[PDB]
């Protein structure tokens, strides 16, 4: 039945963001996409069915969805429209998501902290923190 990844399951809404514009600059997102993406207030819906985890993000800007098995690489289309190769693992209760494309890498960590789901994104020393709460 239960799995430790079950504390991520649910419907989550973005409540705060820090330095996301600069993170997007470092990833290579252009001006217009940064402005519109930075405005959005996505909801993230996280579900598990057997070994498959699904993370859906719905917003006024873009909708994105990934389904994956921990430790098994997959192809992802990001919200900013990169085509990346991704691997997601669980390390000490933290979901660690690495995206690789064009010789570049970014890492997105998702952790449960109190009643929050905290998303920490890093690229070449630039970090952003985005905090989600239950919807
Ligand atoms: O989960 C996040 O909030 C999040 C959201 C992203 O894009 C959006 C933004 C607004 C609405 C819908 C999707 C995003 O896009 C990749 C980017 F940032 F490179 F553009 N990356 C992340 C994250 F890095 F942190 F995972």
UniProtKB/Swiss-Prot annotation:
Gene Ontology cellular-component terms listed: cytoplasm; cytosol; extracellular exosome; lipid droplet; nucleus
Gene Ontology biological-process entries: brown fat cell differentiation; cellular response to lithium ion; cellular response to tumor necrosis factor; cholesterol homeostasis; fatty acid transport; long-chain fatty acid transport; negative regulation of DNA-templated transcription; positive regulation of cold-induced thermogenesis
Any one GO molecular-function label of the UniProt entry: long-chain fatty acid transmembrane transporter activity
Main localization category: cytoplasm
Key word Disulfide bond present: no
Binding site for a fatty acid: 130-132
Residues with the Phosphotyrosine modification: 23
InterPro entries membership: Calycin, Fatty_acid-bd, ILBP, Lipocln_cytosolic_FA-bd_dom
Xref: SUPFAM superfamilies: Lipocalins (SSF50814)
Domain of life from the UniProt record: Eukaryota
One Pfam family here: Lipocalin
Localisation: Cytoplasm; Nucleus
Residue numbers of Phosphoserine PTMs: 16
Domains (record comment): Forms a beta-barrel structure that accommodates hydrophobic ligands in its interior.
Family statement drawn from the similarity comment of this UniProt entry: Belongs to the calycin superfamily. Fatty-acid binding protein (FABP) family.
Function description: Lipid transport protein in adipocytes. Binds both long chain fatty acids and retinoic acid. Delivers long-chain fatty acids and retinoic acid to their cognate receptors in the nucleus.
Subunit record text: Monomer. Homodimer. Interacts with PPARG.
UniProt-recorded name of the protein: Fatty acid-binding protein, adipocyte
Organism: Homo sapiens (Human)
């Amino acid at each position: 039945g239960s799995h430790m990844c079950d504390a991520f399951v649910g419907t989550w809404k973005l409540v705060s963001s820090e330095n996301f514009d600069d993170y997007m600059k470092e990833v290579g997102v252009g001006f217009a996409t940064r402005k519109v993406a930075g405005m959005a207030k996505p909801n993230m819906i996280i579900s598990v069915n057997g070994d498959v985890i699904t993370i859906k993000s719905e917003s006024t800007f873009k909708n994105t969805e990934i389904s994956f098995i921990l430790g098994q690489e997959f192809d992802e289309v990001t919200a900013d429209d990169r085509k990346v190769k991704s691997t997601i693992t669980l390390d000490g209760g933290v979901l660690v998501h690495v995206q690789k494309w064009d010789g570049k890498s970014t890492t997105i960590k998702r952790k449960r902290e109190d009643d929050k789901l905290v998303v920490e994104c890093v690229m070449k020393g630039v970090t952003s923190t985005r905090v989600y709460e239950r919807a």
